[PDB]
A paper describes a structure:
The crystal structure of 5NSDO from Bradyrhizobium sp. was determined at 2.1 Å resolution by the molecular-replacement technique using a theoretical model predicted by AlphaFold. The asymmetric unit contains one tetramer. Each subunit of 5NSDO folds as a monocupin domain (residues 81–152) which consists of eight β-strands organized into two four-stranded antiparallel β-sheets that are a characteristic feature of this superfamily (β-barrel). The tetramer is mainly stabilized by the long flexible N-terminal region of each subunit, which makes interactions with all three of the other subunits. The quaternary structure is arranged in such a way that the active metal sites are oriented towards the external edge of the tetramer. Comparing the 5NSDO structure with those of closely related ring-cleaving dioxygenases of the same class, for example SDO and GDO, we found that the active-site residues are poorly conserved, as expected from the unusual activity exhibited by the enzyme, which accepts 5-chloro­salicylate and 5-nitrosalicylate as substrates but not gentisate and salicylate. Specifically, the residues which interact with the 5-OH group of gentisate (Asp174 and Trp104) are missing in 5NSDO, explaining the lack of activity of 5NSDO towards gentisate. Arg127, which is supposed to facilitate the deprotonation of the substrate in SDO, is substituted by Tyr104 in 5NSDO, likely due to the lower pK a of the substrate hydroxyl group compared with salicylate. Unfortunately, in all four 5NSDO subunits electron density for the side chain of Tyr58 was absent, so it was not included in the model.
Numbering used by the authors:
A (entry chain A), B (entry chain C): 0 to 179
C (entry chain B): 0 to 181
D (entry chain D): 0 to 182
């Protein structure tokens, strides 16, 4: 965890006036978000211009900036929901990993196989599949079209509570409590 | 909600790199918090030095500034928990209200009556009581010693989702969606 | 809220053994879920065989039964996510309503108009759109192909907390605190 | 994690009618809870009738049974908050552990030391202290009176999401994903 000192007391543990609490707690409203697939597809195909790019790092996140706290730019698609899209070229692999964040996958394009906890399934467009919290899961695109997926995850909720664990690549030595 | 416009597009609706998302979603760890009762009671007595202050506003938030997100000083006592303390003098009342946020009460000191949806209970030190989401509740402090309450609630969670409602004072025409 | 008595005290307010909390707090793990679009679409068609069906009631919930608490059937697609699909025939409307639950809409097929808080967008397939909590929103399907939507929402989370509100149809008198008996 | 088979398809993956869904998500309302400290203390003191009782297991949970899904006996104090109380005799210890659930401690009675990630703090009645998610923490009661603490936590939130981790005793080999099965 951390090397810290309480020998100067606890300056961070404070007591504030209800007006400051209330002023910080109430949020602006968020305008509706709209995103177009062409732009998502443009974004992701742009990722291939980077030499340092591979299949495991080829996600964009779909965000509504109004959703942020205070005046800050948010990263949720709504306040409590998070969403990303991913491109996998045929023949690419996303190797086994796990995280206690769950993921919800919707196949927009492409075919392939998904492996979770030793079992393979062969996917096709508009399949829906989940990778349960802390389940080992891996991808391989097949066929002649890129796999593009629309993904809902709660990684961010757990990050904010500081309860996110990730293990990539596979192997106990790779487990991390996900904090800066 | 809002008068708004899409006539110029949805500039707030965006698509971002996985590295930006990751960087904004991982949080700093949080040093343990410690608060002293004396400081809480002192904070509360201070408020009385406001002439324009009454029983319904006599609350302080207990915060651990580390639990903030990104650069924000936090207002939770932990990331996902929120705590307040409140002081009612004998013969004061917090009149009927409701909010969709729940509240959990620990009576540290004092006695009196809690009314929730038409039923009255007489509390004493170290009683524990809940005011269910959206239930009409009211307080009347009795005896000679001030009522001091230690309060756990989820008001901030609903506030962040923009899903929080507040009816004060009693009367459906007083309901507000709590944003702005 | 409710008429209730405490005259008999608080029998439901208990104190339980650590063993009992733990036996009840720890869940079974959950097998991964897999749904095929064809099962969804078939499901949505069946609903038209009902004469007492219209645009507004025409949704199915995609569920993972393993996700239940204790030994019960779950209602989530994951423990904390909720997923629905809806079908609107062209020329149908979903009338203006609001709820403090949020909705994330993916257009799989169809075209039409989304109205949110007085602003209209014309959607096409694979567009993504949100209806923020408690915003007035309305649907009208256009063109020739049915609109089919993949929808994620937090309604169940708010319901479990008993902090969910729903106003349908539009009008403050239609507001309900969504608990068994409204 | 899981020895499972998809060789017989995925029968748990269902599609249900809105009517069945709505019928299942909407819950009964919850009566207010009230609990009295005398009864809590009596509970905790009772537990010491068990001879194989120690400081690590001297907790009871404070529950509002109306809070459960369906007509089920729930275990939250509210739907989304969970509350326990614990008794530590002076000279007893809760040894180092960590869990990704947070804990919020209110000292009702007693005195002692709280250690979190190498730092000690000496506690007294009506002190408020947190043990952040995944921080090593340990207790030792001092003085001539039992430590009684009023504790709020989100262990159950995490348990339900199947995202709860627990390491007791200290040491990585003892980390568990907390699901029925894995310790
Ligand atoms: Fe993954
Ligand atoms: Fe209140
Ligand atoms: Fe709606
Ligand atoms: Fe602990």
């Amino acid at each position: 965890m951390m090397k810290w000192s309480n020998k100067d007391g606890y300056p961070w543990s404070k007591i504030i006036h209800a007006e400051k609490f209330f002023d910080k707690v109430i949020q602006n409203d968020t305008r509706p978000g709209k995103w177009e697939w062409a732009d998502v597809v443009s974004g992701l195909r742009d990722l291939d211009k980077d030499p340092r790019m591979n299949s495991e790092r080829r996600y964009v996140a779909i965000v509504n900036e109004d959703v942020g706290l205070g005046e800050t730019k948010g990263i949720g698609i709504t306040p409590g929901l998070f969403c990303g899209c991913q491109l996998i070229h045929p023949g690419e692999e996303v190797t086994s990993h796990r995280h206690n964040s769950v993921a919800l996958y919707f196949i927009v394009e492409g075919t392939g196989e998904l492996e979770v906890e030793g079992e393979v399934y062969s996917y096709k467009p508009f399949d829906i599949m989940t990778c349960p919290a802390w389940s080992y899961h891996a991808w391989r695109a097949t066929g002649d079209k890129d796999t593009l997926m629309y993904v809902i995850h709660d990684m961010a909720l757990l990050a904010y509570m500081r309860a996110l664990f990730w293990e990539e690549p596979k192997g106990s030595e790779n487990i991390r409590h996900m904090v800066k």
